[PDB]
Amino acid sequence: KETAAAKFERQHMDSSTSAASSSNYCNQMMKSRNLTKDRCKPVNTFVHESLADVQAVCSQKNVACKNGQTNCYQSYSTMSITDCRETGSSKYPNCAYKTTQANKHIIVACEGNPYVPVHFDASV
Ligand SMILES: Nc1ncnc2c1ncn2[C@@H]1O[C@H](COP(=O)(O)OP(=O)(O)O)[C@@H](O)[C@H]1O
Numbered sequence: 310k311e312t313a314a315a316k317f318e319r320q321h322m323d324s325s326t327s328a329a330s331s332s333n334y335c336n337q338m339m340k341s342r343n344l345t346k347d348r349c350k351p352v353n354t355f356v357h358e359s360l361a362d363v364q365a366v367c368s369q370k371n372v373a374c375k376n377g378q379t380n381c382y383q384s385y386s387t388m389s390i391t392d393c394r395e396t397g398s399s400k401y402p403n404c405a406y407k408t409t410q411a412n413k414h415i416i417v418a419c420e421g422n423p424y425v426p427v428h429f430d431a432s433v
Contacts (some may be wrong), residue, residue: 313420313427320344321429322363328389328410335393335406349404351393356415357389363426367419373428374430380418381430387412390432393419 311319319342323385335353344350354365366384374381392409399405411432 312341314425317417317426317428318360321354321356321426323357323391324359326357328357328391330391330408330410332408333407334391336404337389338399339362339393339404339406345402345404349399349401351395353393354415354432355391355393356429357391362388362418364416365414367424367426372416374416374418378418380420381416382419383433384414386414388415390415392432 325375334412338355339345339353344353366382370383372381372383390413392411393406396405396407413432415432416430417426418430419425420427
């Protein structure tokens with residue numbers, strides 16, 4: 310009974326660290342957030358901003374989504390993020406990732422009422 314909005318928080322929000330992500334952050338976070346249960350999710354981004362700040366992006370700059378839908382929004386301000394990208398030698402269930410911290414604008418897709426983030430589209 311996890312909502313799409315709740316899933317976005319689980320998969321992409323990490324407001325509890327002001328970004329200080331160790332080289333093992335993704336290995337730990339990808340498993341702790343259940344993104345390596347059925348397999349190793351290839352790529353996934355975590356956002357280190359407050360929940361309110363990320364939810365606010367749904368009212369920010371409307372930009373085309375990678376899938377062609379019109380429900381994507383880019384943050385006006387840059388945000389603290391961590392990208393997780395499965396290593397070339399990662400072998401499920403031993404999911405291995407490279408951790409890369411950055412400060413970039415995020416692009417999320419929003420749906421529902423309230424209109425909230427449900428998908429992480431890209432960082433730019
Ligand atoms: N424009 C969009 N592009 C991609 N997915 C979208 C879009 N708008 C809504 N969604 C929904 O967002 C959800 C994304 O879920 P999931 O694949 O688990 O996480 P993520 O895409 O954030 O890694 C799906 O229910 C999908 O249909």
